[PDB]
């Protein structure tokens, strides 16, 4: 469920937040996303 505060457990990556659609350019091997501060930003759905 998108656009709602939920606790996600994506492939063992625990956390909390709001998730929705995006327009990244994830390369085939890419799995995660971060920033210059090294914090998990975007996750690829394992079953989607």
């Amino acid at each position: 469920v998108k656009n709602k505060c939920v606790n996600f457990n994506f492939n063992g990556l625990t956390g909390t937040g709001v998730l929705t659609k995006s327009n990244k350019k994830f390369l085939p091997f890419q799995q995660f996303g971060r920033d210059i501060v090294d914090t998990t930003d975007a996750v690829r759905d394992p079953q989607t």
Partner: peptide
């Protein structure tokens, strides 16, 4: 047979260290 000539690498041989998407 084969040779063993030496050349320069220049800028070459850089890979993605991890599988973490990054931008800007």
């Amino acid at each position: 047979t084969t040779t063993q000539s030496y050349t320069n690498s220049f800028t070459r041989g850089v890979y993605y260290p991890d599988k973490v998407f990054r931008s800007s």
